[PDB]
Structures are given as structure tokens and as C-alpha cells.
């Protein structure tokens, strides 16, 4: 019967493409960090305009979430930080137009049922990206060494 | 004559059955409904339609707690009496089952209605945690 990759097609029936699958699996729901090859692949695929839209529209709905789904925002800021300084130049221009989205994540606070503020990592992760996008002299170089 | 309750544009027999099994009401899922879901979970295309709906129903919050609760009882029946791939689907999505162990909610009356979602989510994790008894339970299902 079905094995390992057939059960992973549960998202394929849910209307997803290869680019939409791995960017969805990148911002997973466990304490695992996205594999760099997935972040590297997303950077290379961001050059294609068809993939770049599906990538950004996916992270758009992953960043506007709150509640117990704090791993939607924390991991999306991680891949978005990689796309900004490794992928297409439109990844920078896209964050400049949706700038007030990560600007509101500056105050993300979600406490789980144990007195632990899980949103603290989302605070420093969002404040760092804003400080990077507002430094064009720094941001331009960071995209140069990664070539 | 009473096909009128098929006001379901887009969904199929399997998708409507699982939605009617986890609907937001006081009606409890019956065994003849659960055994049909377990029977259809053996079929390939029917299996994904059951998991795709339980996925959208388990990931609910707010006052729609009855969608999450019934999806746990339905999933428990699919782990034991359903297909083997149902257990594989629960292993790859074992975190969605654990995130509901911290679920909390109470209606505007004062009673914590999330108390039942926790216990149902807890015993399901401990069920999959005991892989020895799992094959034992799936063996009796002859
Ligand atoms: O986008 P949306 O909210 O509709 O659903 C996301 C995604 O499509 C999968 O349903 C989830 O992954 P998985 O099905 O749980 O693997 C994912 O959870 P997480 O992994 O992003 O938390 C969801 O965020």
C-alpha cells in the first residue's frame, strides 16, 4: 500500500504545487528548523515570477496568524529573512510594500498554557528584519556576498 | 425523496459523511457512521478525503470546539479499525494531535468545554505512544 511520499500527497489533493508544498512544509508546526536546502531552493525559485508569487502569498497568510499557531509566524520570518538576502530582488521589494505587516509583528505576544511567552522569539526576529530592510547600505552588501 | 439535505455543492459522499459526523451540534457520532469511515479509509482516494476534512476540522479554535472534539473520536476509530495508512497519517501529523492537549475554552456559561478536548487528545497521544498495544488492538479487528 501507500508508504512515505504517497501520504505526503495529502496536500497535493488540497490544491498545491511543488513550490507551494515545500514553502508550506518549511514553516512546519514542530520544533524543527527549516532545512537550508529548502531555504536555498526557495531563494532560487523566487527568481521565477510564477513561483515568487506563490511563495510570498503563502508567507502572507502565514504571517497574519496569531494564537497557538505561533510557529506560522516565527518560521515564516526565518525563511523571509533568507529570501530577502538570498533570493530574487523582488523579495526585498515585496517586503517594502508589505512593510507594515512585519511592523505589527514587533509586538507579537502569545503565552502558552504554562506561563512561557512563546512570542519573544518572534519579537527579536521581526525587529531584526525591519532593522535590516531600513539599512539599504547594509542590505545591498548582504545580497552581494551570497553569490 | 428527501435528497434535499444534499445541498452540498463541491463535496462528495465521503466528504459529506465526515462533515456530518463532526458537525457542530450535540449529536454524537454513531458507530455505523464511524465503521463506514473506517471501511472507506481502506480505499485510496476516499482515504485522502477523510484526512483532508479532519485536518480542516482539527485545526479549529474559538467557540467551534465541537468540530475538534468529534474529529478526535473519529480519528481514534480510524487508528484502530481504519486502514494502516491512517496510523501513518497520524504519525506524520503527531504534532497537531499534541497541540490540542493544551486546548482551553469555556462557553458563556462558565463550564470549561475544552476539558473534554484535552482528555480525548491525551489518550490518543498515549495510544500512538504505545505501539505495542496498537498492533495488539489492530489485530483483534478481524
Ligand atoms: O495555510 P493554512 O492555514 O490554511 O494551512 C497550513 C498548511 O496548509 C497545512 O494545513 C499545515 O501544515 P500541516 O498539515 O500540519 O503539515 C500548516 O500548519 P503549520 O505547519 O504551518 O503549523 C498550516 O499553517
Author numbering:
A (entry chain A): 1 to 147
B (entry chain B): 6 to 147
Provide passages from the article that reported this PDB entry.
A crystal structure was determined of a complex between the ENTH domain of Ent2 (ENTH2) from S. cerevisiae and the PIP2 phospholipid to a resolution of 3.4 Å. The structure shows two ENTH2 domains sandwiched around one PIP2 molecule. The inositol head group of PIP2 is bound to the previously identified phosphatidylinositol-binding pocket of one of the ENTH2 molecules. In the second ENTH2 molecule, the N-terminal α0 is unfolded (ENTH2Noα0), and the electron density suggests the N-terminal residues are extended. In the ENTH2/PIP2 structure, the α0 helix points away from the ENTH2 domain and there are no interactions with the phosphoinositol group. As a result of α0 reorientation pointing away from the ENTH2α0 molecule, the second ENTH2Noα0 molecule can form interactions with the phosphatidylinositol head group. However, most of the buried area (1020 Å2) contributed to the dimer interface comes from the α0 helix of the ENTHα0 domain, which is repositioned by the PIP2 molecule to facilitate dimer formation. The effect of PIP2 binding is therefore twofold; it attaches the ENTH domain to the membrane and displaces the α0 helix, so it can form a dimer with a second ENTH domain. In the ENTH2/PIP2 structure, two α0 helices from symmetry-related ENTH2α0 molecules stack against each other to create a homotetramer containing two PIP2 molecules in the same plane, ready to insert into the membrane. We thus conclude that the PIP2/ENTH2 crystal structure shows an intermediate state, where the binding of one PIP2 dimerizes two ENTH2 domains and prepares the “empty” ENTH domain to bind another PIP2.
